[PDB]
Each structure stands twice: as C-alpha cells, then as structure tokens.
C-alpha cells in the first residue's frame, strides 16, 4: 500500500542538469512533479481519464497490464532568457514546464 | 535497462472488470495501453513534454524524483450502449477510452 497520486514540490537548478550555460535566467525554477499510486478507489479528485479507470481495473485482474500512472494533467509555461546558437539572448515562454495539476492517466 | 515507452494492444472484456451488466454493447473493446521506460535519450518520438525532459534529467542526479511515465498523450472516444439508472438503454460516445498515442509525461 503506497501513497496516492498528487502534486509535489520540486525546485530544479539548471546547473544540476547541465543547462545553466545556455540558460541565462533564471538560475532555476519550480517545476513540481507528480508521484504516487493510482489505485481503485480512484479518488474522484485523482483526475483520472476514463481509460485510466479501465486500465486500473484490468491491472487488478491482470498485473501484466500496469496501473495508471501519476502524471501532469495540466501544465504552465515559464519565462526564460537563453542563448540562441548565435549567442544572442532570447526571451521566451517555454510551454509545459511547470506542473499545475496531477492525475492518473 | 528496460524497454521504452510505446503503445501496446489491450482488449478489455467488460465481464472481466465487472461492467458487462450495465453495458449492453459492445461486449468489450480495444483500449490499448502505454508501457515502457522514459530514459534520456528521450526519443524525439517519445512525445515528451518539456517538463518530462526536465524531470528525467533530475531523476538521473536524484532518484528520489521519479522518471517520466509512459502515458496516453492522445485518446479516442468509443460508442457504447448502456443502462441508465432507470434501466433505459442509452447510446453515447464515452470520451477518452481508446489510446491513440503514448508519450513520456
């Protein structure tokens, strides 16, 4: 019996992932992450897709098929200053960088 | 070294999941499912979100944070005949029932 799917805090420092050279600003950001099991009773707020519900049921009677996985169901952009290949500074909103909600999919 | 994220076939019989009573037709359907690891080099066709790429990198230097998970990134409805609570037959397209594409999220 492991914990259930939800949203956890995660600060990513760009230097820890070898990205601080091509990324000028910020030094890092709060990406968050989703972790936890997807068990039936899928909590109504597990944000489960219909297929997640089916697959979870199937796993119970057939563990060859995995349970649904706790993944981001909604993400947010984050503003970034970074080099192009010409070493010119670029301001840009990178899509799908910050987790807003998690759910079993 | 485990296999990578992709789409696998999965036929779900409604009787195997205790659903054949309230579902008149069909007897079952091809739901498919996503399974496999999400490792860097994330294949360009791993359909990875930007956050999936970040989280995968983080996992490598910090295994407290999990790798991205192989989940459906696009789903399809399936037509269903089923009982309401008044035992009247209902025809309806149930959204997000069939996996069309998988990707590390």
Query: Residue A70 sits in a domain of what CATH number?
Result: 2.10.90.10
For A58, phi then psi, to 5°, come to -60, -45
Which of B2, B7, B51 is best to mutate for the A interface (most A CBs within 10 A)?
B51
Closest partner residue to A35 (CB to CB) among B66, B97, B105 is: B66
The gap from C-alpha A100 to its chain's centroid, in whole angstroms, comes to 9
Domain span including residue B44: 1-105
E strands of chain B, at which residues?
6-8, 11-13, 23-25, 28-30, 33-35, 70-83, 89-104
Collapsing DSSP states into helix, strand and coil, what is residue B47? Answer: coil
Q: Is B12 on the interface with A (CB under 8 A)?
A: yes
The resolution in angstroms reads 2.1
Distance in Å, alpha carbon of B49 to nearest chain A alpha carbon: 6
Q: Residue B78's closest CA among B58, B92, B61?
A: B92
- Tell me the technique behind this structure: X-ray
Only one residue has tokens 């149930």, namely B94
Split into its structural domains, chain A has a count of: 1
d(CA B73, CA B5): 12
**Pair of tokens at residue A23:** 């990324």
Which residues in chain B have their CB less than 8 angstroms from residue A50's CB?
Answer: 94-97
Q: Which of residues 17-36 of B touch A (CB under 8 A)?
A: 17-19, 31, 33, 35
Cβ separation A31–B68 shorter than 8 A? no
């Amino acid at each position: 019996l492991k914990s259930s799917c939800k949203r956890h805090p995660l600060y990513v420092d760009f230097s820890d992932v070898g990205w601080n050279d091509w990324i000028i600003a910020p030094s890092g950001y709060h990406a968050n992450y989703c972790d936890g099991e997807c068990p039936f009773p899928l909590a109504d707020h597990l944000n489960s897709t219909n297929h997640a519900i089916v697959q979870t049921l199937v796993n119970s009677v057939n563990s060859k098929i995995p349970k649904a996985c706790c993944v981001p169901t909604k993400l947010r952009p984050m503003s970034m200053l970074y080099y192009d290949d010409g070493q010119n500074i670029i301001k840009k909103d990178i899509q799908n960088m910050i987790v807003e909600e998690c759910g079993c999919s």
